[PDB]
Design a protein around this nucleic acid. Structure first.
Ligand SMILES: Nc1ncnc2c1ncn2[C@@H]1O[C@H](COP(=O)(O)OP(=O)(O)O)[C@@H](O)[C@H]1O
Lengths: 864, 139
DNA sequence: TTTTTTTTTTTTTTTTTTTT
């Protein structure tokens, strides 16, 4: 990795090889599966079928790049005609080199000559071996490219040598404990390696001896195996090539493509291998990770498929086909977009002490490649990319309506913070902790590079590469200080805000109505029971409340006090259940029914006590007070309740008259207007009474009413259930008590769960005998024209009656005729020849249920 | 220099962010210093660090003089050629950077780093929350 | 003299303010 970039840097011949491959050998492309190719680079798996000219040129260039001592991973495959290539997996007892002798090698040459004379015959012998010092000794490859007899005869020779005992005896003389299995039967059926072609994470072979032995068809009995002199004068790479017939010295007698494609694929491979496959075993978590990877692009379909082969008993007959089914589902899925952050968190949880150094090596290699690319001159983007690599799941950047860039940070426990922000996101204006991380936390990692370079400077090298390393260190010393310059940090931040940008993040914030932020995390009320997330998540939550959640415990003394006081406020069990059910829906933030709740009382009743408690429990984020002038009037006023699920009015003190206007506009769940939506529950209470003049069929259907039957005063009235001693403590205090608020929140969420499980989230399903009884009584009331009848001249007289009875105001006689006709005067209606609706039979007088056992919150059975 | 400021002279000032987003400073006054009348032992709001500038220029220079004389002393000690050359390069670099403390741009950079290092979360809102504390002209 | 020095640039602001 690092050495690859180094060699690409301080070796011009490597650059020449790269240019030759990219320009000249581009036209010589070969299919990966086609066998017409002759050269395959194990680095990139590029199949090539170079002609003789390209073959000789590449042989020469590889000869040079070998002769300085570089590294190369090119391989050749035997064709229809080829020389002899052999493998000896000499797994000796000890990894100690025996002094193999040239006479012994000549005896081996005689043995192989005997083994080949009993075949088709009409030679240079090269012995190369590993640099040794490795378990089970080294491996040996004799190379004989002189002949061309690539056929099953090679298999026959391999078999003949397999049972050969002379070679085994020679090996035993060389102290080999493994006389057999060193020569694999598939030696000639696999591609070979050119001289200097090392194995992956291994070292290239080095030649040992070269012996020239001519042959004669008439009588090969004479054998001059006499040693070759001065092999260095020849291009050994070209001479040793099987496909090279024109040699001078010699004579012619899909996981891989995924790992090759970008490093993030293999990084995901590693991090997926880090955690145990136990989570993969079960369907839920495995499907979760498949969905998560499918959300992040679609190229990882084989990658997940690669992860699918594990547990074949669960993969085949099941997992295999459901894998592609889930992939097809996720290709169009839009409900959730889990990303690699969850996988990183899982690797954090399950397998510690290892992913730290793994990612450290990863981004250290990234930064080493960066610094190598431009010789120690690093700029704002150059550091900013590594910074993005550092904290990829900690910060996010978005653009507001004004266009200003704004940051957001995922507050977690164990860091300095405010009260009630753990495990959830907070807005932020100018990255502060990012600056310290850049200047200090990052500073350690690059220090590693420093010593790393010094390490490579400590090792002996050539003068030119040593001078290059000295220049690299000198350049890097200048960039050393720039981690502290403030203009440098400002430029780094300005560059990085582009990298950290995430499109469509502010507008999708808080869009889930079932997710509510609390003092100790976030609650998802999507399912029953609601789930508290006290760990990493992937949800856009910014609004919250400072009320910590506790499980609904009726055994809490404060819970008992709240239940008793709430029962005392309105003793009617059915009415109490209905009103608590209505109030428990304030937590929901989605669309709701077009209803408002208003209820009246004489005064000094249970009003304005539970109202303010509910308001403060919901909080400023989720609740908003509203002025009474919203409905009594004939625009920041309408901007209220944006996302707030609870709307309420203060005490009216005096009496007010509704204008019949904006009433339908504040209740409908449709468009109201800029355009915005309304999702809130409306609750109103007053000491006095209102005036309503309308009898539309839609109206009085989208409306409810109630009257308080209790009275609270300082002097108790004995034997009167409708009077109880007011408890000032309830008001002045019992609000600031955090435990009281937590218990109240638990009680409200309990009633919300009860409503969801019983009536499936509809207030229409739940009915109270008291409700729609007092409501219909009020509906029968608030009628004036019908009352006037039973008490242009008719409409005029109605006008003065209304003025002198309730209120004096301007009147319009055009429409009032319609309600007068629709009144009880329909039967007493007759027409006129002048097309006028004159009146007959008229004369203006102008002369004078059940109770709970011990738990009303138990809600009783369905009738309640 | 900002970390040195935080360490040496850090228990006198606090930095916070207002609603408008402008960074603001607060200082804990002590007896015997220029100030207004009758506010001793309380916290004063302040816009752009003034006494911090004098502290950086005067006290920090005195401290770095100690480092300078320490380096000169260890240079005076007998040593090999390589370590002597290393110390000499340190000497030229440090004396070239000595006068940089008085740069107004550098000083403002130190201030804009201090406004990050000296920040304390949840400080403006926690001011004067206790109803029982009443500031008076004598404390 | 040439390689190196070196070196002031730069930076900051300056102006932007942005403001009702
Ligand atoms: N369930 C209850 N038991 C005892 N006292 C109560 C109960 N509910 C309310 N109270 C008290 O009765 C008083 C009624 O006055 P208040 O609610 O202020 O009248 P209004 O709501 O008309 O302004 C309150 O001070 C409250 O403390």
């Amino acid at each position: 990795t690092i050495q690859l970039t180094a060699q690409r840097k301080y070796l011009a011949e490597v650059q020449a090889l790269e240019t030759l491959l990219t320009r000249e050998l581009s036209v010589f492309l070969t299919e990966p599966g086609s066998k017409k190719t002759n050269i395959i680079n194990r680095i990139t798996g590029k199949t090539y079928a170079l002609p003789s000219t390209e073959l000789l040129r590449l042989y020469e260039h590889l000869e040079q790049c070998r002769k300085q001592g570089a590294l190369m991973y090119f391989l050749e495959r035997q064709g229809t005609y080829s020389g002899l290539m052999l493998d000896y997996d000499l797994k000796l007892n000890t990894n100690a080199v025996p002094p193999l002798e040239p006479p012994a090698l000549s005896r081996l040459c005689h043995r192989i000559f005997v083994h080949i004379k009993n075949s088709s015959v009409l030679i240079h012998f090269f012995f190369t071996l590993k640099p040794e010092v490795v378990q089970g000794k080294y491996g040996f490859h004799v190379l004989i490219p002189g002949l061309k007899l690539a056929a099953s005869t090679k298999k026959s020779i391999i078999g003949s040598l397999q049972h050969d005992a002379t070679v085994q005896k020679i090996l035993h003389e060389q102290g080999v404990t493994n006389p057999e299995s060193c020569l694999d039967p598939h030696s000639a059926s696999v591609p070979s390696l050119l001289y200097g072609s090392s194995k992956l994470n291994h070292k290239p072979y080095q030649l040992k001896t070269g012996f020239e032995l001519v042959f004669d068809s008439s009588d090969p009995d004479y054998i001059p195996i006499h040693q070759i002199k001065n092999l260095e004068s020849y291009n050994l790479v070209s001479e040793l090539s099987l496909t090279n017939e024109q040699g001078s010295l010699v004579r012619p007698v899909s996981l891989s493509i995924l790992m090759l494609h970008d490093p993030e694929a293999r990084y995901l491979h590693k991090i997926l291998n880090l955690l145990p496959p136990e989570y993969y075993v079960e369907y839920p978590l495995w499907s979760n990770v498949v969905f998560a990877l499918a959300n992040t692009s679609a190229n990882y379909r084989p990658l997940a498929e690669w992860f699918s082969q594990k547990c074949p008993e669960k993969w085949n007959t099941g997992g295999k086909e459901k894998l592609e089914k889930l992939w097809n589902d996720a290709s169009h899925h839009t409900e959730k977009k889990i990303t690699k952050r969850s996988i990183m968190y899982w690797a954090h949880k399950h397998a510690p002490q290892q992913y730290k150094e793994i990612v450290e090596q990863g981004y250290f290699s990234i930064l080493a490649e960066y610094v190598y690319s431009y010789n120690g001159m690093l700029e704002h983007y150059m550091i900013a990319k590594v910074i993005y690599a550092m904290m990829g799941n900690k910060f996010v950047v978005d653009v507001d309506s004004n266009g200003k860039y704004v940051w957001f940070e995922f507050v977690l426990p164990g860091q300095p913070m405010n009260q009630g922000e753990i495990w959830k996101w907070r807005k932020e204006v100018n990255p502060d902790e990012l600056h310290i991380y850049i200047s200090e936390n990052f500073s350690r990692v690059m220090d590693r590079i420093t010593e790393h370079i010094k390490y490579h400077l400590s090792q002996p090298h050539e003068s030119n590469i040593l001078n290059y390393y000295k220049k690299l260190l000198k350049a890097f010393e200048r960039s050393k200080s720039k981690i502290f310059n403030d203009s440098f940090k400002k430029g780094v931040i300005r560059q990085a805000e582009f990298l950290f940008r995430q499109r469509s993040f502010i507008q999708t914030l808080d869009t889930n109505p079932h997710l509510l932020g609390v003092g100790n995390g976030v609650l998802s009320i999507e399912t029953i029971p609601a789930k508290l997330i006290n760990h990493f998540h992937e949800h856009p939550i910014h609004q919250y409340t400072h009320i910590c959640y506790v499980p609904f415990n009726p055994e809490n003394p404060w819970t008992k006090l709240l239940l008793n006081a709430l029962q005392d406020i309105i003793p009617e069990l059915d009415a109490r259940l209905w009103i608590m059910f209505y109030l428990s829906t304030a937590i929901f933030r989605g669309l709701k029914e077009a209803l408002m709740l208003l209820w009246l009382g004489g005064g000094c009743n249970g009003k304005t006590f539970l109202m303010r408690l509910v308001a403060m429990v919901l909080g400023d984020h989720y609740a908003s007070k509203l002025n009474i002038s919203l409905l009594t009037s004939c625009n920041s006023a309408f901007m209220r309740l944006k996302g707030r699920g609870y709307g309420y009015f203060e005490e009216t003190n005096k009496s007010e008259v509704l204008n019949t206007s904006r009433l339908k506009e504040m209740v409908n769940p449709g468009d109201v207007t800029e355009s915005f939506q309304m999702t809130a529950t409306m609750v109103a209470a007053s000491n006095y009474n209102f005036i309503i003049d309308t009898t539309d069929h839609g109206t009085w259907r989208r409306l409810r009413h109630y009257r308080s039957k209790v009275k609270f005063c300082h002097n108790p009235d004995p034997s009167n259930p409708y009077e109880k001693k007011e408890d000032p403590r309830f008001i002045h205090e019992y609000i600031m008590d955090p435990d009281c608020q937590n218990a109240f929140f638990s009680i409200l969420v309990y009633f919300w769960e009860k409503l969801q499980k019983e009536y499936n989230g509809q207030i229409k399903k739940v009915f109270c005998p008291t409700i729609e009884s007092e409501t219909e009584a009020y509906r029968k009331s608030q009628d004036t024209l019908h009352r006037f009848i039973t008490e242009s001249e008719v409409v005029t007289a109605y006008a003065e009656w209304y003025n002198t009875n309730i209120n004096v105001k301007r009147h319009i006689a055009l429409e009032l005729s319609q309600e007068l006709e629709n009144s009880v005067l329909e039967k007493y209606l007759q027409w006129s020849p002048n097309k006028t609706r004159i009146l007959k039979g008229c004369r203006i007088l102008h002369k004078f249920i059940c109770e709970p056992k011990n738990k009303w919150w138990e809600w009783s059975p369905n009738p309640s």
